[PDB]
Ligand binder design. Structure first.
Ligand code: NAP
Ligand code: NAP
Ligand code: NAP
Ligand code: NAP
Ligand code: OUO
Ligand code: OUO
Ligand code: OUO
Ligand code: OUO
Ligand code: CA
Ligand code: CA
Ligand code: CA
Ligand code: CA
Ligand code: NA
Ligand code: NA
Ligand code: NA
Lengths: 247, 247, 247, 247
């Protein structure tokens, strides 16, 4: 197993991409801290799937944008399993608005979760990360295709791309790798809830996807396993677009 | 003259890159709104430079991260000159800190000015922008070279890069252009005050700059004039690295 | 004038983008060597346009893929005007073919002109260049959007992009700047002759162009003048996409 | 296993990166066509290492820059194993020269092998490729870092990057994936023979490598296995820099 004996944290693993990543890491032997914000039921369902398949996982509720919660998410890994090897910064929210319609709350909610939450959780985790550890930030293909009416959200993911590059260099001497995955449109709880599935944006994106379908959470999960594993030992500071060819 | 009859706003034009951009735009015929935050005297010096050279300019105090001040900056253009053609989002602050040392205040001050202030000032300006308008965002070469210990600052400029691309697509149908300049290290009031001139970072940047010197504010100002002018009429969504070849 | 007393070579200036660049450089005071391959009549017409407008120019026939012709083009600058300041590597050809249909002739004709010709002309020219010289390579937005059935042509322009970056670093110590322009679809003699204007690809590109039209040669010419001038003194190794926002 | 039942061609598998890729693909169950140009003994040793580990392989001599040899390499897969699933275009040569030292042979040798050979081998292969096939082009991090005195070699790899993007779009409807790996400096027989090991470039590269060593063939081979496998099913048109963090 590619991650035998390792411990991973996946933020926002009660739904969507994060849930798929948690299950996939556990399938390769990692014990997984499954973080949720509002959906304990979703996280418990993911933990039960992992444990019924023979793996180890534990649920932890916490808002990554709150310093004490980010710390407690990380402490859960150390207290439960004694070590930390892999951090997947997946928690994230998205809302579109044209420039005229942007409000302060629309801006702060997305930047606080999608950027400050990445920084706070990584800051808490790095004390426990040693040579060969792997930090995986879930960014978005919007940093390449920058759709209209996404200035705030695409802004958050542009920040994540740059933070990924900074920390790859900053943590290089400690041999901690830092990489991003930039998904295309993925069918998730969130893209249904946001009305993105079924929208004109979805139709446009689908038509421009070379491989001819929308993405699924497991399309991202298998790339996260790769980046978490030693097979990516010589990759750091990369941004892997996983969109079926759209960029 | 390239900008005869046009009106420009330069945020943060009491010092540094913004002051040089303001003077260069006025040299090509633009009437310039010269924004300051803490230094009225600096803005008055730039306005005096412009008017002594035969141009038109007016100072306005305002914090771009405050919605009411962003509105007052834009209203100054309309009240004084009756139109708005060019917006240069130059106001910005920088402070480095390694991941372990990042504080909430360090994060919020830079994102509020460097990202929210771009969004607020652009939001106020767009009501007045018509076909041929040009929005120029001052980003940074850090989105290319992502230096260690710059996670927050590089994050803000990654966000600006993405916002530039979004708004180029979003405002395209109105024939409003949106582009970024990504300066390398420029000798400015701010890089002196921040201790960056004389720092290890300065040494590293100089040692990797193909054209063999640090940048000066006029190195950026002449590119801003280009992007503001009809010479750049077929460029939108670009990010021009102006760093003497460092990328 | 921006290029007063300067001397420029434009390869492939009997038609299209190169003709527009030659006229624009001359409008800013440059004496221009107007190169043609098959159309002396076209180069002579561009020379007449330049001299009727008060400028200086001379035509020279030569195939940039032949070392002796590249040398003769450069010798024409030195022998006629005594110096060389600006080299625009604009000569290029394009033909689409899906992978199954690519022939050796289709491959060699495009790489010999579009790549070897850039190398040979730059190699002859660099001996005469000094501080402040500007080399401008005309690449293509296809290095961003890589359309189907363009493997050979996009291949040539990907080479040109890389050669631009190499020579920017290699000639940095001599303070010779090297930059690329990457045009979008431009209506020219060539794109009419190739049937590209009116194609389904043109409809797709137009629909994806934020500024809502196809490009024209003067859209590129004004950017070439900027890069040739001291206004771009702090830019080297850049690739300026000039496509109305398509990338 | 990840490639059970599948068949791969690795061009240039008698040495270096290609040898390591061939052995790694076979470890995951692929039958491997091991192509060599000058070194039958090297290919035979790779084939033997593969069969000793329980796999299937066959050696074939051929110059990818010769159409008849490229066709025979592909025919070897079909005649020996009946199918083709993975093509690794790894064959490549490198020689540095500053612009004034570039000769016609130096240019043609590298473009014929590194670009035309990729096109010819891919052209022969595509007839046999169906849904789920994976084409992996070995490019180079020089397309990011474009070192001085590498205009021809970096030019070839810039062409490979662009060809990768074209064919990803062109072959997307057939659900054939096309991706590139862009290695940093890898210790191989070729870098020994080229005077790269022990050069000033090796010192420059190693000092700018965040993860603190030179690369090894298996650093690339594990990424090739990922791209060949269904784990990369949602990635096409990507360029994976595998350089220990240098870009
Ligand atoms: N098409 C796409 O789906 C797409 C494309 C590109 C990038 N992305 C990125 O992929 C990531 C996941 O997207 P998704 O579509 O899977 O989202 P989703 O279905 O809406 O799931 C979001 C997950 O993040 C959690 N979360 C949200 N805010 C949080 C906070 N403050 N603290 C902790 N956890 C928080 C949610 O927790 P609860 O549900 O328990 O509250 C949930 O587990 C995000 O970073 C998103 O930006 C998605
Ligand atoms: N090497 C560099 O200098 C460098 C490199 C890359 C990018 N940049 C970017 O270039 C821009 C200018 O940098 P600089 O070095 O010229 O800076 P500077 O010398 O420190 O000048 C900063 C200017 O921004 C104004 N400003 C700051 N906060 C503001 C706020 N909240 N509202 C309105 N105006 C505000 C300042 O006003 P007062 O002084 O009146 O308070 C001043 O006019 C920034 O966006 C920076 O990130 C700089
Ligand atoms: N949409 C576009 O038009 C477009 C988009 C992106 C990039 N580009 C690039 O822009 C450049 C100009 O394109 P264009 O559309 O203006 O082409 P064009 O109208 O066909 O004109 C091509 C010019 O190049 C010259 N030329 C061709 N082969 C030559 C050779 N071997 N030696 C010397 N000169 C040679 C031609 O000379 P003669 O006519 O006298 O033989 C002519 O002056 C090319 O590099 C092209 O790849 C064009
Ligand atoms: N640092 C690096 O090593 C580095 C970095 C980035 C990219 N790359 C790329 O990685 C690839 C492999 O490099 P390497 O260092 O492993 O090279 P290497 O050790 O020199 O091995 C080259 C291989 O290519 C074969 N080859 C050469 N010309 C050929 C032709 N015309 N037809 C068929 N096969 C041919 C050789 O065959 P014979 O030996 O049997 O003649 C050999 O098997 C190349 O594409 C190179 O550009 C290498
Ligand atoms: O536009 C796309 O291709 C994906 C949009 C998706 C949901 O907003 C995201 O990037 O998070
Ligand atoms: O890294 C450089 O060369 C530039 C640093 C400069 C001041 O922090 C900035 O990007 O604002
Ligand atoms: O596809 C586009 O956007 C431009 C195509 C054009 C002619 O082939 C060129 O790149 O030279
Ligand atoms: O410059 C590097 O980091 C790698 C050089 C290597 C051999 O020339 C190549 O790209 O093929
Ligand atoms: Ca884009
Ligand atoms: Ca970089
Ligand atoms: Ca693309
Ligand atoms: Ca570079
Ligand atoms: Na304080
Ligand atoms: Na660019
Ligand atoms: Na990449």
């Amino acid at each position: 197993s590619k991650l035998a004996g390792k411990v991973a944290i996946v933020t926002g693993a009660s739904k969507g991409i994060g849930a798929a990543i948690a299950k996939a890491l556990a399938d390769e032997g990692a014990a997984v801290v499954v973080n949720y914000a509002s959906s304990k039921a979703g996280a418990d369902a993911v933990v039960s799937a992992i444990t019924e398949a023979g793996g180890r996982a534990v649920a932890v509720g916490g808002d990554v944008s709150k310093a004490a919660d980010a710390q407690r998410i990380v402490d859960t890994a150390i207290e439960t399993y004694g070590r930390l090897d892999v951090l997947v910064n997946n928690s994230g929210v998205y809302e579109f608005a044209p420039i005229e319609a942007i409000t302060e709350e629309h801006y702060r909610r997305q930047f606080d979760t999608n950027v400050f939450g990445v920084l706070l959780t990584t800051q808490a985790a790095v004390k426990h990360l040693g040579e060969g550890a792997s930090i995986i930030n879930i960014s978005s293909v919007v940093t390449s295709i920058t759709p209209p009416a996404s200035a705030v959200y695409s802004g958050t993911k542009g920040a994540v791309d740059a933070i990924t590059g900074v920390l790859a260099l900053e943590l290089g001497p400690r041999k901690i790798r830092v990489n991003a995955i930039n998904p295309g449109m993925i069918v998730t709880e969130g893209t249904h809830s946001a009305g993105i599935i079924g929208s004109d944006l979805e139709a446009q994106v689908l038509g421009q996807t070379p491989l001819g379908r929308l993405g699924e959470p497991n399309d991202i999960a298998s790339v996260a396993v790769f980046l978490a594993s030693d097979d990516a030992r010589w990759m750091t500071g990369e941004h892997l677009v996983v969109s079926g060819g759209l960029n």
